[PDB]
């Protein structure tokens, strides 16, 4: 994946985002030995709720006099192993808005990858 | 794909979004007989730029006294045929913000699908 659009700094340090996403994916599918189409919905739901709860919490201003300053969208995709190329463009505020993507690579026996993308939008 | 989050009406009628996306995909990969990893970047770039240009244009207020009211993000993914499940959650304004997704199904010989997602964010 690669962004076509210029962008602002993440309200959350990208090393923390990486940890949030890696932990979310691990909690959801870490013990899974195979891709199971019957569980992908449950898996994706758990990943997204985990990440969203974490980024909402940690993007909050320390003081009550300042309300949440960022909207977030979080997408999670589970892809069964085979060829995949993704791109993102935007019409937004290049000083403040942006995206970050994460790939949770499954090993040989896993038979699936998890790709996560987070968008933040100021105000 | 399915959204986990409640949402507002599209600033552009969804039948028009469907046409924009279908035409963009057709223009980019309509004449392609096979999946080619060496062309996916060019294909995705064309699709996204086409869609973005169209949605920017048609979301503009008719009057100059009112500036653009929506930010947009557009993601395009080209997937080689094999198992794929996607989900989206959000922390946004449920009265005004939302997402829309489109799948351009490739026939047997095509060997690839195109999935498009558009997010709109008020103000």
Residue numbers in the entry:
A (entry chain A), B (entry chain A): -2 to 79, 113 to 153
Copy text verbatim from the article accompanying this structure deposition:
Here we present the crystal structure of the protein encoded by MGG_01005, a gene that is important for vegetative mycelial growth of M. oryzae. Although there is only low sequence conservation with the Dynein light chain Tctex-type 1 (dynlt1/3), from yeast, human, mouse and fruit fly, the crystal structure of the gene product, MGG_01005, adopts the dynein light-chain Tctex-1 fold. Pull-down and yeast two-hybrid analysis demonstrate an interaction with the N-terminal region of the M. oryzae dynein intermediate chain (DIC) MoDyn1I2 as observed for other dynlt1/3 proteins confirming MGG_01005 as the dynlt1/3 of M. oryzae. Importantly, the structure of a complex of MGG_01005 with an N-terminal peptide from MoDyn1I2117–150 together with mutagenesis studies reveal that a di-histidine motif, widely conserved in dynlt1/3 proteins interacts with a highly conserved glutamate residue in the DIC.
